[PDB]
């Protein structure tokens, strides 16, 4: 809505749609109604538009993004046309926040008055779009070509006081904006002749091609698979043209960006982050437990990184270890990590000191006695878990949540080591745990709903993207990545080499291909897993290539030698001859005559192995929705943000096509791998996507 009130010959229209006065249909309609009332009232000499509560306006209402209501007249474009046509002067009274369509609205007024401390931005580029209601044409008219380009391409906010000396604001005041804007409006309300419009100003620049030529290169370099930045710059370039020509060019660039798979991807990830908190049978408002202090078992790499997430949020942690010397080691690693970021200018040494001030360390389980949340981060061996969780069950206060960081193991069985399996949950962090955003929350059969809701809340407090998985081997992320690695392996058997595979998938947009990732994790880990599996019920095939690699002792970066060789101080992974010889020989030993594998086949085999397993995950109810799997891949495995996640990418390719490619691969080497997931084949045949 918009409220309307006259006072002293000034109609004041107040945007009122908390939390940020989003420009939804009812708000846009309120602005127009208010304008109509103000223009009819002969006592009204001028008009002030402002916002209620904590914003002028943050722009588009996200709750409407995706309704018919987002496009229902009056649109922001038609709102602005009304403001521009007003015979009475319109003064925007800007405080706190004016972003996107909000800023576009203020720019459509005759005058603008701002208080200091207001966040000013056009962040459309962040969802893969551009400011599509005149911002690219009006902003350079008030702050200059280069400054508008910078704001619009970066999407970054700027405090209102920094616009002093430009034409964005006619007056900047220290305190309350409304009384100064009403007074301003009284003064222009008495003047006679017509009032200014930003569209009448002209962008002035001594050498626009000079500037833009340089800017084009630097933008193209930074933008790396995102089309919006350059299109934003080309829109702002249009502001040199007559207004209506510039505006048409802005609109065209908007409509172009709206079609891009990248804008779809950025939106999918925005909305997917928000939806990850939704659990079908744990409704919003399920009450949670207070988590004030935390404990972590293990001071090694994982325990340490986990701890830091809590310290960074202001939540104290006690780390338990066995030997005092482990503590000293672990704590020094944490302080090293923090001092490294302070060296790189990413926090102060005072902030380092306060975070280390919240860290305690013990050797006794008995000092874990009033922690509200205890996270176990020890050796991945069920018998070690049993020892830890039995101690925790004696020691921990009633109501404490007992969490395992396990990436593999059966959380239902961990829980059965205690008398209170309802308080046992998986909290699977990803390495390095202070950097990776993903938190895979594993819901045990017995895990309470309160406990689940609590871990979700804690996740958001320590700035993780928390996604809920049911219990199965590998949960969501690792279960899928096994199928991806399996295909990688098979490619080597058939004719690929490691660098070739990693480059192809890295070009597709993964941060790190599977062979480099195997080397970083340690190839020995997967080796032991496979050896125990071959003894078990599974008679799955894997390429023996990885086994043969470990039989050479080439564990990866930790031994300087994995699929590739590594030199200290040197980020390049170097191909190794002995490795490549073993691969070529291995194909000989299978009687496989090697073939040339395209980069395209590499990407399809890798990505589509993810997709197929994700669809089985969905069918089982292990993940509650496809976007959850996308967020896992975006936040845990370096899947390209510009493509949205594996499931969204399958949708973008067309599930009909994906199923065809699978059916083709089923005719080849280990075709057992390429039976189409039932859910995927059903969506394909109905013409549907995983995500709608």
Catalytic residues: 104, 124
Residues 6+ apart with CB under 8 A from 452: 279, 282, 425, 441, 443, 468
Are 572 and 619 in contact by the 8 Å Cβ rule? The answer is no
Are 235 and 216 in contact by the 8 Å Cβ rule? The answer is no
- First-to-last C-alpha distance (Å) of the chain: 31
Strands (DSSP E) contained in 359-422 are 359-362, 373-376, 401-404
Are 96 and 103 in contact by the 8 Å Cβ rule? The answer is no
Distance between CA atoms of 514 and 502, rounded to whole angstroms? 6
Are 447 and 414 in contact by the 8 Å Cβ rule? The answer is no
Q: β-strands 119-121, 111-115: how paired?
A: unpaired
Distance between CA atoms of 535 and 532, rounded to whole angstroms? 5
Place of tokens 């931005």: 121
Distance between CA atoms of 267 and 77, rounded to whole angstroms? 22
CA separation (Å) from 184 to 34, 113, 206? 19, 8, 34
* Token couple for 345: 């200018």
Strands (DSSP E) contained in 432-550 are 438-442, 465-469
CA separation (Å) from 45 to 79, 178, 187, 254? 20, 16, 10, 37
Place of tokens 């996740």: 459
Q: Is 365 annotated as a binding residue?
A: yes
Q: DSSP state, 322?
A: S
* Token couple for 55: 């914003």
**Largest pairwise CA distance in the chain:** 95
**Secondary structure, 3-state, 559-627:** HCECCEECCCCCCCCEECHHHHHHHHHHHHHCCCCCCCCCHHHHHHHHHHHHHHHHHHHHHHCCCCCHH
Are 227 and 261 in contact by the 8 Å Cβ rule? The answer is no
Query: Helix, strand, coil % (nearest 5) of the chain?
Result: 55, 10, 35
Q: Is 300 annotated as a binding residue?
A: yes
Q: Is 301 annotated as a binding residue?
A: yes
Nearest-5° angle of CA 193, CA 198, CA 200?
70
Place of tokens 């018919």: 68
* Token couple for 64: 């409407």
Q: Is 380 annotated as a binding residue?
A: yes
Distance between CA atoms of 486 and 606, rounded to whole angstroms? 9
| Peptide bond connecting 432 to the previous residue in cis, omega within 30 degrees of 0 | yes
Centroid of chain to Cα 226: 15
Residues placed in the known binding site for NAD(+): 300-302, 321, 365, 380
Residues placed in the known binding site: 300-302, 321, 365, 380
């Amino acid at each position: 809505t918009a409220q309307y009130q006259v006072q002293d010959g000034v109609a004041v229209i107040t945007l009122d749609n908390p939390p940020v006065n989003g420009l939804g249909h009812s708000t846009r309609l309120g602005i127009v109604e208010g304008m109509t009332r103000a223009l009819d009232d002969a006592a009204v000499k001028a008009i002030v538009i402002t916002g209620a509560g904590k914003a002028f306006s943050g722009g588009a209402d996200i709750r409407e993004f995706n309704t018919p209501k987002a496009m229902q007249e009056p649109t922001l474009h038609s709102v602005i046309r009304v403001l521009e046509g007003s015979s009475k002067p319109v003064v925007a009274a800007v405080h706190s926040v004016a972003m996107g369509g909000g800023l576009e609205l203020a720019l459509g007024c005759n005058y603008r008055v701002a208080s200091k401390g207001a966040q000013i931005a056009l962040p459309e580029v962040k969802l893969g779009l551009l400011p599509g209601a005149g911002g690219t044409q009006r902003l350079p008219r008030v702050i200059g070509l280069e400054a508008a380009a910078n704001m619009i391409v970066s999407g970054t906010p700027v405090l209102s006081e920094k616009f002093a000396g430009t034409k964005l604001f006619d007056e900047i005041v220290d305190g309350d904006v409304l009384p100064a804007a009403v007074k301003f409006a009284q003064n222009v309300g008495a003047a006679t002749g017509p009032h200014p419009k930003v569209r009448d100003l002209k962008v002035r620049h001594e050498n626009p091609e000079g500037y833009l030529g340089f800017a084009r290169n630097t933008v193209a370099a930074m933008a790396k698979n995102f089309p919006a930045p350059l299109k934003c710059l080309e829109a702002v370039a249009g502001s040199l043209k007559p207004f209506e020509q510039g505006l048409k060019q802005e609109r065209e660039g908007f409509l172009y960006l709206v079609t891009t798979p990248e804008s779809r991807a950025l939106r999918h990830a925005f909305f997917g982050e928000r939806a990850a908190s939704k659990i079908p049978d744990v409704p919003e408002g399920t009450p949670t437990r207070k988590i004030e202090k935390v404990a972590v078992i293990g001071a090694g790499t994982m325990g340490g990184g986990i701890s830091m997430n809590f310290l960074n949020a202001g939540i104290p942690v006690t780390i338990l270890e066995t030997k005092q010397e482990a503590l000293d080691r672990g704590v020094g690693i944490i302080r090293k990590n923090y001092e490294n970021s302070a060296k790189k200018g990413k926090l102060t040494q005072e902030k380092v000191e306060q975070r280390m001030g919240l860290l305690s360390t013990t050797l006794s389980y008995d000092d874990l006695k009033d922690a509200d949340l205890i996270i176990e981060a020890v050796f991945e061996e069920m018998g070690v878990k049993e020892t830890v969780f039995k101690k925790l069950d004696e020691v921990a206060k009633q109501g404490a949540i007992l969490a395992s960081n396990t990436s593999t193991l059966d959380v239902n069985k961990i829980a059965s080591f205690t008398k209170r399996p309802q308080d046992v949950v998986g909290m699977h962090f990803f390495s390095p745990a202070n950097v990776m955003k993903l938190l895979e929350v594993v819901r045990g059969e017995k895990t309470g709903k309160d406990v689940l809701a609590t871990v979700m809340q804690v996740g958001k407090k320590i700035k993780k993207t928390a996604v809920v998985s049911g219990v199965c081997d590998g949960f969501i992320g690792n279960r899928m990545i096994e199928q991806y690695s399996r295909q990688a392996g098979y490619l080597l058997d058939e004719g690929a080499l490691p660098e070739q595979v990693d480059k192809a998938i890295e070009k597709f947009g993964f941060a790190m291909g599977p062979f480099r990732m195997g080397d970083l994790a340690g190839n020995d880990i997967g080796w032991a897993i496979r050896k125990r599996r071959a003894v078990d019920k599974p008679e799955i095939q894997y390429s023996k290539t990885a086994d043969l690699l470990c039989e050479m002792g080439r564990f990866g970066q930790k031994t300087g030698a994995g699929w590739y060789d590594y030199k200290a101080g040197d980020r390049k992974p170097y191909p190794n001859q002995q490795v490549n010889d073993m691969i070529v020989q291995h194909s000989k030993d299978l009687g496989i005559t090697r073939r040339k594998i395209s980069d395209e086949e590499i990407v399809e085999r890798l990505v589509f192995a993810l997709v197929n397993e994700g669809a089985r995950i969905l069918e089982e109810g292990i993940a509650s929705k496809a976007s959850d799997i996308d967020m896992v891949y975006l936040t845990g495995y370096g899947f390209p943000l510009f493509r949205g996640g594996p499931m969204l990418y399958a949708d973008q390719v067309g599930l009909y096509n994906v199923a065809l490619s699978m059916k083709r691969y089923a005719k080849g080497y280990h075709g057992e791998a390429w039976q189409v997931a039932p859910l995927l084949q059903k969506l394909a045949d109905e013409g549907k996507g995983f995500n709608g």
